[PDB]
Design a protein around this nucleic acid. Structure first.
Ligand code: MG
Ligand code: MG
Ligand code: MG
Ligand code: MG
Ligand code: MG
Ligand code: MG
Ligand code: MG
Ligand code: MG
Ligand code: MG
Ligand code: MG
Ligand code: MG
Ligand code: MG
Ligand code: MG
Ligand code: MG
Ligand code: MG
Ligand code: MG
Ligand code: MG
Ligand code: MG
Lengths: 85, 141, 135
RNA sequence: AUUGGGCGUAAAGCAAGCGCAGGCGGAUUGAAAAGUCUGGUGUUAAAGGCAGCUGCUUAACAGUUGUAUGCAUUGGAAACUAUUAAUCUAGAGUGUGGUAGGGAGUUUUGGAAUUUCAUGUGGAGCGGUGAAAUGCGUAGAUAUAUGAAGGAACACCAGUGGCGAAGGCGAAAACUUAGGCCAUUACUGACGCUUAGGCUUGAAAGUGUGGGGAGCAAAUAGGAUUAGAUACCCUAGUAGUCCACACCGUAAACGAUAGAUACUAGCUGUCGGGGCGAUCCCCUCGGUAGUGAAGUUAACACAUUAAGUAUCUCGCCUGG
RNA sequence: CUGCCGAUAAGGUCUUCAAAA
């Protein structure tokens, strides 16, 4: 079994437990990644981090380095494969 | 029920439906549309009795001058169809007429053979029961 | 192709040709016409004995013969064996075959049958070369 | 290879088009019953065929009973095809309204550039090559400035482009003219696809007659190179390349992929019509490209413009 | 940075084998 956070560009056949989500945002990823970790920690009998939790304890910050921009650009770095004769 | 696209169909009436079914199965599509004819309507009725398609609805225009049948395929929960392969026998040009003694059995009865003898389209088993044969439209298994 | 196309021009089968054509021609002599009647083996008369060289891999001296059969066809027939009594003018009873070394030769002389002698000093596979059982 | 094969790169899609006969062919209603199915009767000589049995010591064999196939006639079935009598518009056309084009022919017009000639200035080479030599030049060449004559082809625009069935089409204008795309509350009402035979067009070379000839150059002459050079290089150079009218009908005439019809993920461009109204960009309907999964292929690869799932028709292939 | 630069007699080995350890 393999679970994954597909982000609209993945073949759904390969994954089993698909989890529709983002993958480019340093906030969505962490929330979801901790959530799976949270299941494991509860099964292992250690306290949870994000799951089954109110607003004040789920709050997370946006890493450094208006709204956040989840735009895919840098298309100019895809020219035609060198050809011609 | 309303549409948005123009509906066209081929001139040959058995393989037109057959192409629609085969393309939808391979492309995993479910709902398709085509023009409605009485031969095409009758073959779809026996198909749903045999349990190869789920629903089959024939419709007419608001003027009563055109009819188009829009059928859907019967996919299981895991999304694999019930139809495995379709092949037409009595193609245009060469029409196939076989007597009762030579009525074919498709995949030892697993598939169904469409035979329109004298009372419209008719399955192979019931054709054998009445001991009467005739035009053979297509093989479906 | 198409049902209509084949109805107009049906499927014509490819022909079949023999490997020993000269053995299936019979000349009547009273009318001088040649009919095509198959015959296993035929009698002829030799015209020129000698030797030929094989194609490429093989290297040797193989004894050929230009024998004219009871018909009017001249065929080069290999004398299959070690040693021959052919004397340029003689009668032979040719059979079918095709030696691969010499190009053009497509017949063999049945040994030890008519004027041609048998192949003595042979104890193996004699029934084919024609030698009396040592006994 | 009807059952039972193929035509991009292995044999095989005619160069393309207009197309009669033939084949195939939208939907609904009525009749007939030619195909189609079925019942009855007649017949399909005997031997042989298959099954069972008997008789030869069993067998081979002989006899014995059974055992189909087709044709005709008669009585029914009416789903499909064919025939006939009619209705409908969705296929295909026509008209109105938008509209893009190097689509074609005929007749005129224009400027650079080359060559030749005319007139000045000028004074020793120019030209050509790997290096040179034929060749041109004190009869003043090359060069420079002006002018005249003549023929051929139409820089830039010019394209990750447009048009035509193909060959092909690119300076400007006039006349004549072909097809195409989009929207149609209009009209006819299956009039449609393919096409043996037939007809039309068809790059360049070539032919016949009459013009034209600036440049270039098969054939030819000379100088080089070379062991030799009838070739690659150079200097000359006729037919030809050009026009009008008559033929020839072949090309790697290639997308090496016949035409028509319906369906099958998506993404990025670009062109035209339409909808909105600065462009730009969004949507719809089409043409032309790239990438790309299912699918196909021997592999390369094709992939909504198929070589994919299927049907119709024509042409073609059967080892070297 | 384009000179020049042509030829090479015939036929031939070599994989025995996995039954298995
Ligand atoms: Mg083959
Ligand atoms: Mg070929
Ligand atoms: Mg072609
Ligand atoms: Mg060809
Ligand atoms: Mg046409
Ligand atoms: Mg016709
Ligand atoms: Mg019909
Ligand atoms: Mg009989
Ligand atoms: Mg007998
Ligand atoms: Mg001048
Ligand atoms: Mg020409
Ligand atoms: Mg000379
Ligand atoms: Mg010259
Ligand atoms: Mg000439
Ligand atoms: Mg040709
Ligand atoms: Mg590709
Ligand atoms: Mg041959
Ligand atoms: Mg040298």
């Amino acid at each position: 079994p393999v679970v994954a956070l597909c982000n609209t560009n993945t073949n759904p056949e390969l994954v089993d437990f698909i989890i529709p989500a983002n993958n480019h945002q340093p906030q969505s990823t962490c929330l979801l990644m901790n959530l799976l970790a949270d299941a494991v920690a509860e099964a292992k009998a250690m306290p949870t981090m994000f799951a089954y939790k109110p607003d004040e304890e789920i709050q997370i910050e946006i890493p450094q380095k208006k709204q956040i921009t989840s735009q895919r650009l840098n298309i100019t770095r895809n020219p035609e494969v060198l050809t011609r004769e | 029920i309303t549409t948005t696209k123009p509906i066209k169909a081929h001139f040959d009436p058995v393989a037109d439906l057959l192409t629609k079914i085969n393309n939808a199965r391979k492309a995993k599509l479910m709902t398709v549309t085509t023009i409605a004819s009485k031969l095409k309507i009758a073959i779809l009725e026996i198909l749903v009795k045999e349990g190869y398609l789920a629903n089959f609805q024939v419709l007419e225009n608001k003027s009563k001058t055109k009819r188009i049948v829009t059928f859907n395929l019967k996919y299981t929960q895991r999304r694999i169809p019930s139809i495995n392969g379709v092949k037409q026998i009595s193609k245009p040009g060469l029409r196939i007429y076989r007597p009762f003694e030579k009525l074919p059995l498709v995949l030892n009865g697993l598939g169904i053979a469409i035979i329109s003898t004298s009372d419209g389209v008719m399955t192979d088993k019931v054709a054998r029961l009445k001991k009467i044969g005739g035009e053979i439209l297509a093989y479906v298994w | 192709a198409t049902i209509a196309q084949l109805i107009r021009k049906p499927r014509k089968k490819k022909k079949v040709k023999s490997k020993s054509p000269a053995l299936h021609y019979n000349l009547n002599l009273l009318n001088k016409k040649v009919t095509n009647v198959y015959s296993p083996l035929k009698r002829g008369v030799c015209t020129r004995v000698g030797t030929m060289t094989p194609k490429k891999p093989n290297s040797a001296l193989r004894k050929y013969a230009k024998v004219r059969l009871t018909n009017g066809f001249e065929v080069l027939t290999y004398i299959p064996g070690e040693g021959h009594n052919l004397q340029e003018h003689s009668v032979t009873l040719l059979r079918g075959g095709r030696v691969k070394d010499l190009p053009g030769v497509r017949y063999h002389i049945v040994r030890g049958t008519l004027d041609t002698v048998g192949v003595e000093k042979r104890r193996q596979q004699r029934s084919a070369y024609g030698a009396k059982k040592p006994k």
